[PDB]
């Protein structure tokens, strides 16, 4: 999501990256503004691997979730 | 089907029936009072409890150890005054079950046990 490029998780395991419970995404988006001016705003995004440990307001703040198939992930 | 529970596939079983139980079992092992009595020998637990009581007669020594005879159950022994008593704590995906009560947290279970160790043993 940050770099918009694909890397198989196997390659990252070779790289030995450290999985974090919480992750941040810094996407630079140009802002629609009057007069044609563009400002490269870097809006952070929050990624949660385990969604159970979120408060109700945080659950409201959720806007997107990737489904891997089976429904047992969602139950709860 | 595991007992009365339903599971969509093996990943659900491992990630929900075992992983919480493994975490719950790990919590008991990491507890300060945990000890390894040769895989859960009753005689070793009795001897250790008696020795601890002898060292500090005023205090009530209680210990928690894993039971090899009944995997998934932990042997909780305590010696209030005389012969140490032994009970079973079963590890379940919902937490720990002891005397017909389920406690998600180990700390809560210990507090209940300390405050209710004098109650009669259920089923006897």
Curated annotation (Swiss-Prot), chain A:
Belongs to the CDC73 family. It comes from the Eukaryota. It is linked to Hyperparathyroidism 1: An autosomal dominant disorder characterized by hypercalcemia, elevated parathyroid hormone (PTH) levels, and uniglandular or multiglandular parathyroid hyperplasia, adenomas, and carcinomas. Hyperparathyroidism 2 with jaw tumors: An autosomal dominant neoplasia syndrome characterized by primary hyperparathyroidism, ossifying fibroma of the maxilla and/or mandible, renal tumor, and uterine tumors. It is associated with increased risk of parathyroid cancer. Found in adrenal and parathyroid glands, kidney and heart. It is found in: Nucleus. Phosphorylated. Dephosphorylated by PTPN11. This is Parafibromin. The chain holds residues 381 to 456 of 531 of the full protein. Tumor suppressor probably involved in transcriptional and post-transcriptional control pathways. May be involved in cell cycle progression through the regulation of cyclin D1/PRAD1 expression. Component of the PAF1 complex (PAF1C) which has multiple functions during transcription by RNA polymerase II and is implicated in regulation of development and maintenance of embryonic stem cell pluripotency. Component of the PAF1 complex, which consists of CDC73, PAF1, LEO1, CTR9, RTF1 and SKIC8. The PAF1 complex interacts with PHF5A. Within the PAF1 complex interacts directly with PHF5A. Interacts with POLR2A, CPSF1, CPSF4, CSTF2, KMT2A/MLL1 and CTNNB1. Interacts with a Set1-like complex that has histone methyltransferase activity and methylates histone H3. Found in a complex with BCL9L or BCL9, CDC73, CTNNB1 and PYGO1 indicative for the participation in a nuclear Wnt signaling complex. Interacts with PTPN11. Interacts with SETD5.
From Swiss-Prot, chain B:
Ubiquitously expressed. The modification Phosphotyrosine is found at residue 117. It is found in: Nucleus. Histone H3-H4 chaperone that plays a key role in the regulation of transcription elongation and mRNA processing. Enhances the transcription elongation by RNA polymerase II (RNAPII) and is also required for the efficient activation of transcriptional elongation by the HIV-1 nuclear transcriptional activator, Tat. Besides chaperoning histones in transcription, acts to transport and splice mRNA by forming a complex with IWS1 and the C-terminal domain (CTD) of the RNAPII subunit RPB1 (POLR2A). Interacts with RNA polymerase II and the DRB sensitivity-inducing factor complex (DSIF complex), which is composed of SUPT5H and SUPT4H1. Interacts with KDM6A. Interacts (via SH2 domain) with SETD1A. Interacts (via SH2 domain) with POLR2A phosphorylated at 'Ser-2'. Interacts with IWS1, AICDA and PAAF1. Interacts with histone H2B and H3. Interacts with WDR43. (Microbial infection) Interacts with human cytomegalovirus/HHV-5 protein UL69. Belongs to the SPT6 family. This is Transcription elongation factor SPT6. It comes from Homo sapiens. The chain holds residues 1399 to 1522 of 1726 of the full protein.
């Amino acid at each position: 999501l940050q770099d918009l490029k694909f890397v198989p998780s196997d390659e990252k395991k070779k790289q030995g990256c450290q999985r974090e419970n919480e992750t941040l995404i810094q996407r630079r988006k140009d802002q629609m503004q009057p007069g044609g001016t563009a400002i490269s705003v870097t809006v952070p995004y929050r990624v949660v691997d385990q969604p159970l440990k979120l408060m109700p307001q945080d659950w409201d703040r959720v806007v997107a979730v990737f489904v891997q198939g089976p429904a047992w992930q969602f139950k709860g | 089907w595991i007992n009365s529970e339903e599971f969509e596939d093996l990943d659900e079983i491992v990630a929900r029936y075992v992983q919480p139980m493994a975490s719950f079992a790990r919590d008991l092992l990491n507890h300060k009072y945990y000890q390894d009595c040769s895989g859960g020998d009753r005689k070793k637990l009795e001897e250790l409890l008696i020795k601890t009581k002898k060292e500090k007669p005023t205090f009530i020594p209680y210990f928690i150890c894993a039971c090899k005879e009944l995997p998934g159950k932990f042997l909780l022994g305590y010696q209030p005054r005389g012969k140490p008593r032994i009970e079973y704590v079963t590890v379940t995906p919902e937490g720990f079950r002891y005397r017909g009560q389920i406690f998600p947290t180990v700390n809560g279970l210990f507090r209940w046990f300390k405050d209710h160790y004098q109650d009669p043993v259920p089923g006897i």
